[PDB]
Automatic annotation (TrEMBL), chain E:
Entry's localization field: Vacuole membrane
Organism from which the protein derives: Saccharomyces cerevisiae (strain RM11-1a) (Baker's yeast)
Chemical reaction(s) catalysed: ATP + H2O + 4 H(+)(in) = ADP + phosphate + 5 H(+)(out)
Boundaries of every ATPase F1/V1/A1 complex alpha/beta subunit N-terminal domain copy: 4-66
Full protein name: V-type proton ATPase catalytic subunit A
EC annotation from Swiss-Prot or TrEMBL: 7.1.2.2
Amino acid sequence: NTVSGVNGPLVILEKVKFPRYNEIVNLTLPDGTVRQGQVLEIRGDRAIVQVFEGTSGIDVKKTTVEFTGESLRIPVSEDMLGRIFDGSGRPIDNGPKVFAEDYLDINGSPINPYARIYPEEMISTGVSAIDTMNSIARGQKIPIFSASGLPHNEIAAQICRQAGLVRPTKDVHDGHEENFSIVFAAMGVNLETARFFKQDFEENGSLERTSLFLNLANDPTIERIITPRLALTTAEYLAYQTERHVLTILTDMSSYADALREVSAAREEVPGRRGYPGYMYTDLSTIYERAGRVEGRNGSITQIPILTMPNDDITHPIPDLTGYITEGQIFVDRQLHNKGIYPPINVLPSLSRLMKSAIGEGMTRKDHGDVSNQLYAKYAIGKDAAAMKAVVGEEALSIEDKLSLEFLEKFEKTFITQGAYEDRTVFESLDQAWSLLRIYPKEMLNRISPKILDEFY
Amino acid sequence: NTVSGVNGPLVILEKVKFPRYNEIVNLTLPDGTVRQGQVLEIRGDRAIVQVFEGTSGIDVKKTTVEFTGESLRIPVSEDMLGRIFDGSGRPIDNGPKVFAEDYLDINGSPINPYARIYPEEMISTGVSAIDTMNSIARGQKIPIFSASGLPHNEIAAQICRQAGLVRPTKDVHDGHEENFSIVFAAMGVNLETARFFKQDFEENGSLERTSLFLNLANDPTIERIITPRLALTTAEYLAYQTERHVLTILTDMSSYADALREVSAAREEVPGRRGYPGYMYTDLSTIYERAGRVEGRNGSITQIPILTMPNDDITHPIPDLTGYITEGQIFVDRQLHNKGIYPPINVLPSLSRLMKSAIGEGMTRKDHGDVSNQLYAKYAIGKDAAAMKAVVGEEALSIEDKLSLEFLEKFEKTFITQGAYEDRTVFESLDQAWSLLRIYPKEMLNRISPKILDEFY
Amino acid sequence: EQKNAGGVGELEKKAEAGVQGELAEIKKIAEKKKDDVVKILIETVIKPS
Amino acid sequence: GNFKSKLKKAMLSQQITKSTIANKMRLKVLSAREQSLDGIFEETKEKLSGIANNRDEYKPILQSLIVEALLKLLEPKAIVKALERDVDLIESMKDDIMREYGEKAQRAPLEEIVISNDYLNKDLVSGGVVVSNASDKIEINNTLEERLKLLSEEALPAIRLELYG
Amino acid sequence: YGAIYSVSGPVVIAENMIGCAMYELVKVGHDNLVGEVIRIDGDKATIQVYEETAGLTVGDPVLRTGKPLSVELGPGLMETIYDGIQRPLKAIKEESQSIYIPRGIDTPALDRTIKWQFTPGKFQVGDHISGGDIYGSVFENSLISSHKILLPPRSRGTITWIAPAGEYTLDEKILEVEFDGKKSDFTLYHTWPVRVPRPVTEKLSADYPLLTGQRVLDALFPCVQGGTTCIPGAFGCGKTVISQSLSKYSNSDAIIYVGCGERGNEMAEVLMEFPELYTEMSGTKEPIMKRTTLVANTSNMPVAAREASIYTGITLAEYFRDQGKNVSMIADSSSRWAEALREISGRLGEMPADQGFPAYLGAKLASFYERAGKAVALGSPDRTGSVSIVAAVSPAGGDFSDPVTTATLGITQVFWGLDKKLAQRKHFPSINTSVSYSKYTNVLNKFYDSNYPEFPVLRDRMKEILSNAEELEQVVQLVGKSALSDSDKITLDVATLIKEDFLQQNGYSTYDAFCPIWKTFDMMRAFISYHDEAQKAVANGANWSKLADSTGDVKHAVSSSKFFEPSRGEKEVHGEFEKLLSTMQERFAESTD
């Protein structure tokens, strides 16, 4: 019938039991504005709808309803690549829509076929510092843990753009032969930030290869939590049906977690620590279920979410729970940003859980593990060496410290510092590794087999 | 009537209004099994029951209710020692039956007659650190504060078994003239624990000495709360009617407190500090009030509750509350345990404020109390010096500090180090204690009265 | 140990001799007060309680 | 060293037997104490059935069992489930009950006693009746075994004071 | 039967539900999704539905299954990958073209395609038979004891029909029992609700170890079956390794692996690896997997299955304990089972206790520990079997001061401290003698002394030597090693061999990480005889440098001890150790004089 009332973005409609769960309903206002909603909950003799369109200026006696008869599903096609959409899959490319080859459930997915053969083959991003130190395998969940003293978003454009251009460099190594697609989700983005990504992908010739979903920080929360759900489904259709590796970049996970805190108390339930839901986890897990290698065993959905903490706060529920599901994390340093090293990521608190088993072959070397060890240990001693130097002087500094002092500046200025359109696979990373290491004698390089070393010093 | 609903340990009965508070009701399952519960809340034409036994399987109109029409009382007899009982008001072990000559309430005031005259008779544990530094009396309450790396059960048993051999040596001295009885109640501990305890009591003496109430962890939280109440009824009868000194060993007290915590979580009752009830004060009190000399003044109930601290903190609600209420504190230390001291009791914060009530003088020395204070004081200084030895070194510490570091080491390794069956008389302990004092000079022992130092050195 | 190989004989002899007399008086004193208690029990039942 | 442990070990086995003798005696005593109580209890419900099976002697007792239950019941209609031999006895005294109830209440007289076509067992109940709700929710079991058993809770200390006191 | 009143989230309430129990299995809608009634208010039953309640309008029917949610216990457990409420993942792969189970897909708990050969017991018609007595058995294994079929616990009677020998299906009846008319039929499996502990003849304390086959476990503080144990987490860069190695090296009769709510990389690794690896006792037919029954949940699986996960596993373990077998329950991790409770609470609206974890947590852990332990198995001729729980508890706040860890350690009597720095360098396992304890030590050391080892002497001494070494190492830093006696230097020299051989073992080699319990005792014998003799000899006039040159060959052997084979004539007496003892005594006269 009519709208019974509104309290918040919750709309209470007086209706029998007519819509099924998750059924879209159309609230018809007579003032030239049609609005759509989804029943969030259906109860007896009432339904609770949250509207996709607006949040206020709804009548409580002049509204009429029509039932769409279709529960929420995403129209998935693959002529979606090379197009800009908004947070509900409507195009902001302008001009006619792309439509579907399938309507697939977004709710947890109607078939869920994800890994019980652990990740093999190496995925490069295009940055030496990520690849060698924090290796990512096909369908492996490694996020970027970031903070607010850095532009978290820029660093994110960079990984997306440079990823899947690595795949042609790999075709020459003859490690790949399959078509790579990229799915991009921007959540809670500013207009200016949003345009920055679109223009960057356009330069590289990566725009054709990616679909972008933008949900702006001004659109409803419900729309915003749906945004990754739609993105995880596109990636899955391409992985399963057409046997493609698809890399999905989910920025910003904090926006999504915040949105959930707004809908926590919207709901008639009680939250957990610091006001963030105790069922925050359940929600996050939904993202994660779609993640991994699909059954067919040459297609995958690879996932890199970006999570921003307020000042590296680990008191906050969000890095502590999210960090458990995932297999490592990439930690970014403000101290390096401030010096003016860009990218300013530090590889020492960063981790890849399984790293000798997160690489493949013919697109990596077997020397990968040995170099990750050497690179790591010398950078750490160098961090110690900086502090030491200041106390002792240079007129009392140790000869080993001098090599470590130099190593600290070259690892940062070669491996970490690199351009905004530079691209890297494991072989390229590997050549640059040996030139840093060359300076140390062979007897200081002992975590490496004598075989490898006599060939690459 | 019949069960309306069930929400956790709370059961919703739709009934009629004739029931009284804590009137027993029996739930008849469709299996034809009867389980007992007592009404926690009564209202018009309805009840909320908490069922002792079970918490699931409870139906609607296939189930039935029957009223007992007696509010819960425990059947108490004085022939209870040697006899095996279960923590449920009856043995479900198939042990010798309880019998009744009185049924006594567990509300915390049946006919309760306690101390108008404070404890003056000393009761020994055979352990120097307990007896000398804190003392134990015919009404004393002393908490054993234990940890998750200490073995709580081994110390619990240790104190009890050795206090049974000493206690008849004290009967001959005319510290006593009445029987000794043990009431051991284990509530909701592991099978492994339960078995162990019974084995320990047998070795030292017999199980004829003690009465056993056994409650299993798989049995509910509601059962666990009634388990000490059953112990209290046992002890009060023995003291009152047959002028026996009763010793209660209540393990685990923490087990009981977690149970309280569960019936405010699955209740709508708002909890206090750190998620522990607001009415937590009253629940704990009930156990501790029912202590002291019992009317006739040859009977008594003396308490040693056993607390295991989960975090090992002194900011946790359970250790704090208990401490204000109880007449003494005995702190058992993980660091001593590690070093190879058995018993590994640290007396640094062990304190009694009712120190006078705790000591004896008509079956123990008058010098007992004077020496103990000096010892404690000299131990404490020896600890301040220990921290200073690590920092400063021996490169500035004073002549006086050096004596205090030696005293600390001699004190741990001789006084607190005793065999597993080796029992020390309180008089012999003084001689040991005097050896400890004897290395300090007459100007360092200046705080003590001149009379005592010249007399005994 | 010989006090524990011959103590299994004694495991029943002293258990039996311990209540040999007491089980005869329990069953004796019951047969007297049997009737006397039964009248009380009957009485309580045929009285509305 | 290992002498001392074999020396304790045999003295331990010595006191496991002193303890097991002492337990067999409390077990023989306790189970004898109960065997006697369960033969007193046995005789009373045999005596009672003989009282129940002479109908005219059972008649005022039954009236009273019902009036009693009805005052705990507090409904105008009670469903009484009975034995096939007591339905005839209840029938011949419905008015007397409703009179007798009225005089012992101030609630209202009882409207009806319902003789139902469902009955209590005769190989599970010796005699007596189950007086129940209007929709059969709550029942006062005024059967001979159930009365004797609840009565047992309170009989036990009384019997204990005259028998061992 | 009932009609849906509301669907608010995955919580669905239904009216017109009578005789609805409080653990009642129900199937919601036309789709038949799995759900279970947590609560009841009035006529309305409040159900947590574990599968997506999308497409479910109000007014769909709710059909009672007519009994609680149970798990099936019987033939064809081993070599199957399962859900947290036991649903074969393998069977979905055949049908659906899915790894996981998607919404609206349920299947039975045991496969009905598979048929097993039922052999009658020692009871025939007309015999009275009692709860747990062995009615028959099924044999389908040759590497381990199989599935011995018991009469269902808490069930008695006289057997009307005992099916004779032949192949029957799991589904099909093989028993009818006469107990008040026809009691029911029973089948080859039995159903048991998993939130109810299974009975046994009696429970006992543990006292009885078995082959762990990882040297560090036995040597540092013994590993016992029927134990309670905490192992630290690492989130699959350290956790995974120790779990895989414990399953493979331990030749316990069964192993039941439970992944409560894992990454999904770890679940993927344990299933592929088990047929691939070789038994350490011989036999093929998918070696380790044939001994293994797996419950494998990633965090992505429904939350009730994550909560349920350990309960179903524990019932499984308890079932095999009545057959008489020794079981390792290796559960990973309780923090992840705990996370489920937290989620389920907020959905109901339950108010938790500290750090957002409920108060049902501490009692549910206590109840859980007690189901596990040693017991004399139920069934007429009686055997002994055990259930040993090693549960990992990971970070749940980034520390180990959180409610899950702190609660468990207390009930637990054993802690084994994995070392991170050594773990990142891929020595597994590498247990720290500082943090670790076992309160089982005393009873066990007496058990091995009985059996044949000199075990009490050697284990105690192992600990003291290492503790002592940290304290002497500090005197070397600050004063200098040169001013200290030969005796002290020796105390350290020996500690380094004990550290190198046992503690730094590599579970990537089987001549460096698999040796029997006797073999592990023989190595440790070797090091202790040397310590005493070395201190004896330096006192009678020798030096550290002199001593080192003189011991030579025996010192080299002890260093090389781990590389040696599990046998030399027997796998219980290694002849090379027994003769080594002679070479040491002969060497000590020479060196000293």
